[PDB]
């Protein structure tokens, strides 16, 4: 993991300054992605899906 | 997130129910509405007047 900074604005961030929570984002985890795919696909009625297609 | 099983299953079953063996019905709808709308549009000037 690593932090990426995109600078914006004309004001200068003083030392010991804090970026607000609204200007920061958290990653979408790979294990979260795998969990989503597997849990969603486990509930699929694949016979109905194939028949509908 | 769009692959939620409930919505997928409901949409699939509903599509099966709606469109099973309805090809002839939809063909008849298309033919009849084509003929009716063409006949109506042939009187475009009359409708405007």
UniProtKB/TrEMBL annotation, chain A:
Lineage, broadest ranks: Bacteria, Bacillati, Actinomycetota, Actinomycetes, Mycobacteriales
Gene encoding the protein: mce1C
Name this polypeptide is given: MCE-family protein MCE1c
Species assigned in the record: Mycolicibacterium smegmatis (strain ATCC 700084 / mc(2)155)
From TrEMBL, chain B:
Interval of the full protein contained in this chain: 148 to 196 of 343
Species the sequence originates in: Mycolicibacterium smegmatis (strain ATCC 700084 / mc(2)155)
Lineage: Bacteria, Bacillati, Actinomycetota, Actinomycetes, Mycobacteriales
Protein name: Virulence factor Mce family protein
